[PDB]
């Protein structure tokens, strides 16, 4: 029995979709409800939108953007061409807010239901949807990510917390370099780190949930995952304990490194994808490894999180939709009986409320 | 000028 | 190995 459910929601290439657009740069999937390809049939650049909830009829149009992002929840669509920004809601048929920046954006993605990440060589801004928002500028750019790909932009759920992540080659291998910043101290902090999430924890003990940021690094050190504290805790609150565990990498997959997270707040799981398909399993408490296996034989490039389960869902360049999640009725014995692991199967199954340690 | 266009 | 996926 597995402690996961592994399912596959649908292969993009059934759906005429080229392989060619199927990667990182073409392909968006900011939630669970859409999938957002660019593709150039003939000389004209089109879109298409599949809706997740009514995958066998996509929605194609024409564009002249470099890059197309659906809001997490609304039919509602950013565009850029260079640093022109277009913001469509597709149903009204109307453009709601345009911008020109006086940068290009490298990388962009919504942070929320209504605010825009946006990413320059420079800095990193937010974008409000509400009323005649303009960008605002969140903080300056590291020098530690000069030269890095951004690959990722995340933040709390308070917009306290901002994470940007770049990856680039040092030594023949991929580094992530990670800027973490506080938006109440005013003050970056450079980390070595190739994926992360933050969470909402709330301790036994506290009246108040802790907020937590997860990351995973393959470094010289080998893999690692650390999930901490960040910020002063509430009043009344008890810290966080620190922990820091081994993430493992096999001798055969000495290039691989973690791509994506995603944390279940419903169970408090961290979900970590490798960019070579294999998935990991962790407690977000404890950060005990629950589980690992490869999942996809193709890389995996863009993830989110798959709201039903609580787990995560995401892409490869075969353009598999695949999910991950918690299998509810089988996690608890899993820990039980093939872990061991009675301490962790006892408070998972209180703590999440889980069927299966009435015997252990 | 709109950079998405009608089907 | 690989998981398979329902």
Same mark, same amino acid.
């Given at each position: 029995?597995? #402690? ?57 149009? #024409? ?25 469509? %809601? ?73 994470? *940007? ?11 992530? /370099? ?34 937590? @940021? ?22 009344? %609150? ?10 493992? @990498? ?7 490194? #973690? ?41 995996? @490039? ?19 939709? *695949? ?17 061991? %692991? ?12 889980? /069927?299966? /340690?009435?015997? *252990? | 000028?709109?950079?998405? @266009? #009608?089907?």
């Amino acid at each position: 029995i597995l #402690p996961i459910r592994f399912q596959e929601h649908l292969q993009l290439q059934n759906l005429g979709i080229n392989p060619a657009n199927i990667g990182f740069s073409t392909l968006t999937m900011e939630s669970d409800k859409f999938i957002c390809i660019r593709e150039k049939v003939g000389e004209q650049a089109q879109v298409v939108i599949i809706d997740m909830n009514d995958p066998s009829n996509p929605i194609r149009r #024409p564009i002249s953007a470099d890059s197309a992002i659906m809001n997490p929840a609304s039919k509602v669509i950013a565009l850029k061409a260079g640093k022109t920004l277009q913001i469509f %809601n597709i149903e009204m048929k109307s453009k709601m807010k345009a911008h020109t920046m006086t940068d290009d954006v490298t990388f962009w993605k919504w942070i929320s239901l209504n605010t825009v990440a946006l990413v320059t060589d420079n800095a990193v801004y937010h974008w409000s949807m509400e009323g005649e928002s303009q960008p605002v500028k969140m903080f300056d750019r590291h020098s530690s990510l000069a030269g890095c790909q951004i690959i990722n932009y995340r933040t709390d759920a308070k917009q306290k917390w901002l994470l *940007l992540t770049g990856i680039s080659a040092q030594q023949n291998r991929v580094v992530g /370099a990670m800027q973490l910043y506080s938006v109440d101290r005013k003050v970056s902090q450079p980390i070595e780190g190739h994926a992360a999430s933050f969470a909402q924890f709330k301790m036994e003990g506290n009246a108040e949930e802790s907020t937590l @940021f997860c990351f995973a690094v393959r470094g010289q050190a080998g893999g690692k995952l650390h999930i901490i504290e960040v910020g002063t805790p509430p009043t009344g %609150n008890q810290p966080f304990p620190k922990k820091a565990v081994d993430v493992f @990498f096999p001798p055969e997959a000495q290039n691989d490194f #973690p791509v994506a997270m995603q944390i279940s707040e419903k169970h408090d799981v961290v979900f970590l994808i490798t960019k070579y398909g294999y998935i990991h399993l962790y407690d977000l408490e404890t950060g005990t490894c629950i589980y690992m296996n490869r999942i996809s034989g193709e890389t995996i @490039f863009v993830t989110a999180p798959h709201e039903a389960t609580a787990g995560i869902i995401g892409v490869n360049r075969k353009g598999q939709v *695949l999910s991950v999640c918690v299998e509810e009725e089988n996690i608890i014995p899993y820990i039980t009986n093939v872990l061991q %692991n009675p301490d962790l199967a006892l408070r998972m199954a209180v703590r999440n409320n889980l /069927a299966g /340690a009435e015997e *252990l | 000028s709109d950079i998405l @266009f #009608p089907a």
